[PDB]
Design a protein around this ligand. Structure first.
Ligand code: HEM
Ligand SMILES: CCCc1ccc(C(=O)O)cc1
Ligand SMILES: [Cl-]
Length: 393
């Protein structure tokens, strides 16, 4: 009844060009079995959305990577938010929501926007730049660690730590094993920065610790919640901004529409998140036998959700393989959906908006002018290098 496929969605060949295999996964059925890893897979929008929105049946507390925390030890102590189910999820989630709240964005927007404009001005002086290292990485590094309240020393551990976190959701392949082998210094740095005295006044980290007297979280929960922001808050935006720049570089007609109306910057970024889906996949674990799209999945089974495939499913999207900055993007699953839907999405969208606004106002053309190199990660999709020439407006 359920088709068995040999596709390895964590293989380098798959990462290099996932789109044919994602269509095969969608078209084989609403639910597939991936023999390579002994997991169920859902690649159509409808089933991905359904799984995300039933957290009781498709839980997160047994891990959102391949590993089942009921069977194996987690590689690090479980996240109090990502790897928790309601009701244990609810209070930590509320704290992060308030720390990253609509009102908090007002305090940081002016500085984030000035840093974006300054970065684009700097890049225009160079002309030919690497849109990854010099923009997608450099811009978030220039705003997010400071917004966290981190000291300067040791920030070089942040991107390695995030790459480790995202590789560790994958199966025990070479990418994951190698990341864990190299992890000790990055974990040591990150864990130390999560302690209250190491987080500067007014930043996200200090604000998390300040919530420890309201009854929502205790003091001993705050370090792990700071850890959540140091895990999820940087490399995601690197790949989101990188996706948006790569889209504008490949689709100059959309750059031209963005230049003509810079207020499209927020939706241009949202459409880049749908189009590239920098966060490609997450797992859930069934807590009971369940019927999903005509298939019967037993208890304690891992279900792999293809967020990027859901975001390209023609059953849901018109012209899904086109980058369209005026598309009605609401409902895409690039930030998830439901109770775990990205708690940092206002930060991510703020960064993406102000960078695309700076490009829309200052840049006339973005031309790829060197070899494009892809970066391979078990969960993140994005580029290692994107050589571009920026022409000033
Ligand atoms: C373009 C950038 C980003 C993308 C595409 C993205 C994507 C996602 C997705 C798909 C989830 C759902 C995970 C699940 O359902 O298991 C998620 C959750 C989460 N994200 Fe984001 N994210 C981004 C940026 C950020 C930022 C900037 C922060 C923090 C400052 C952040 C913090 C979190 C946290 C803490 C969670 C867990 C929420 C929960 O479990 O309730 N993310 N993100
Ligand atoms: C796309 C972001 C995924 C993510 C979310 C939360 C955490 C954490 O709570 O440590 C780590 C990774
Ligand atoms: Cl850790």
């Amino acid at each position: 009844t359920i088709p068995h496929l040999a596709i390895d969605p964590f293989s380098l060949d798959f990462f290099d060009d996932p789109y044919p295999d994602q269509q095969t996964l969608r078209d084989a059925g609403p639910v597939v079995y991936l023999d390579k890893w002994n997991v169920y897979g859902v690649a159509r929008y409808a089933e991905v959305h359904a799984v995300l929105n039933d957290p009781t049946t498709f839980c997160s507390s047994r891990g959102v990577g391949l590993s089942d925390f009921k069977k194996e030890k987690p590689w690090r102590p479980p996240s109090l938010i990502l790897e928790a189910d309601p009701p244990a999820h609810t209070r930590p989630r509320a704290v992060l929501s308030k720390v990253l709240s609509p009102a908090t964005m007002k305090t940081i927007r002016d500085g984030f926007a000035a840093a974006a404009d300054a970065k684009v001005d700097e890049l225009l002086q160079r002309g030919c730049i690497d849109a990854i290292a010099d923009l997608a990485e450099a811009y978030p590094l220039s705003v997010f660690p400071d917004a966290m309240g981190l000291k300067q020393e040791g920030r070089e551990h942040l991107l390695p730590y995030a790459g480790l976190v995202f590789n560790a959701f994958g199966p025990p392949n070479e990418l994951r094993q190698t990341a864990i082998e190299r992890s000790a210094p990055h974990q040591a740095y990150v864990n130390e920065q999560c302690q209250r005295p190491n987080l500067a006044p007014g930043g996200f980290g200090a604000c998390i610790h300040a919530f420890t007297d309201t009854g929502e979280i205790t003091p001993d929960e705050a370090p792990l919640l700071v850890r959540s922001l140091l895990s999820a808050g940087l490399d995601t935006t690197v790949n989101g901004i990188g996706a948006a720049v790569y889209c504008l570089a490949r689709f100059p007609g959309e750059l031209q529409r963005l230049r003509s109306d810079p207020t499209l910057a927020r939706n241009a970024f949202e459409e880049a998140v749908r189009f590239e889906s920098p966060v490609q996949t997450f797992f859930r674990t069934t807590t009971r036998e369940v019927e999903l799209g005509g298939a019967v999945i037993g208890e304690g089974e891992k279900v792999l959700m293809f967020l990027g495939s859901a975001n390209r499913d023609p059953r849901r999207w018109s012209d899904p393989d086109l980058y369209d900055i005026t598309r009605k993007t609401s409902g895409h699953v690039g930030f998830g959906s439901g109770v775990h839907m990205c708690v940092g999405q206002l930060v991510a969208r703020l960064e993406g908006e102000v960078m695309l606004s700076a490009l829309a106002r200052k840049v006339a053309a973005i031309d790829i002018d060197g070899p494009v190199k892809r970066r391979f990660n078990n969960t993140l999709r994005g580029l290692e290098s994107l050589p571009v020439k920026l022409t000033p407006a």
